[PDB]
Structure 1
Amino acid sequence: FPNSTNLPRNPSMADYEARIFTFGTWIYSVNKEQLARAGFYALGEGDKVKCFHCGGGLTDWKPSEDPWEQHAKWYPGCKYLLEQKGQEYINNIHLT
């Protein structure tokens, strides 16, 4: 179950630097900057990633798909998400 509290499930991955580093060998076309910025880091197996905060896992990405958009699509309850895009952003992802 994703995290809903305000405590990062993976503290060691709270820095864009820490995270971005995991995409060192990334062979996929999904933009690793956006992924890291959206709060994800690579698990080194396939195109699987997780949110350092809510700890939600995402995989099987399509070319055009947007990290922030996805992160909100599947894990709305995430706080790190809430803090960067705000409730309004989220609500309109699900209502529309």
Structure 2
Amino acid sequence: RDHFALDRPSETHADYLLRTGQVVDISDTIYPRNPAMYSEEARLKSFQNWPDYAHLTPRELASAGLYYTGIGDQVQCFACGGKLKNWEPGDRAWSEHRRHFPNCFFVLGRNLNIRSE
């Protein structure tokens, strides 16, 4: 019969929460387009032999969700898929990433621990 007096009928898990919660962010997926550099450390490898005049720091790029494709000073976002070339002095690595691709789920909430609050 109705074990537990009901059997957790009202809300059980995501599959059930879908009725209201809904997992679909904005109906456009959101999985990384290059997990190879999902971790900051891994991203480091991306900048294997990072020049000294590129434009910005290699790590910072990783922290910004940018993976180097060996194309000179051209970096791209492995998450949403935002490539940017022809950088200039002053334009923050990801600062231009959002300007040309502001729909990056990483840009907004940053992602990763970095709780603080």
Whether these two folds match at TM > 0.5 is yes
The runs of 4+ residues in structure 1 deviating greater than 4 Å are none
More helix as a share of residues:
1
**RMSD, aligned α-carbons:** 1.7
What is the aligned-residue identity percentage? 40
**Distance in 1, Cα, partners of 2:45 & 2:102:** 25
Q: Does 1:20 align with 2:11?
A: no
- 1:41–1:52 contact (8 Å) kept in structure 2: yes
- Alignment of 1:71 with 2:60, yes or no, is no
Partner SS, residue 76 of structure 2: strand
The answer to whether structure 1 residue 35 and structure 2 residue 74 are counterparts is: no
Asked whether the 8 Å contact 2:55–2:73 carries over to 1, the reply is no
Structure 2 unaligned regions, length at least 5: 1-27, 112-117
Distance in 2 separating the partners of 1:73 and 1:10: 21
Q: In 1, are the aligned partners of 2:46 and 2:67 still within 8 Å (CA)?
A: yes
The structure that has the greater radius of gyration is 2
Deviation, 1:74, is 0.9
Q: Which runs of 5+ in 1 are unaligned?
A: 86-96
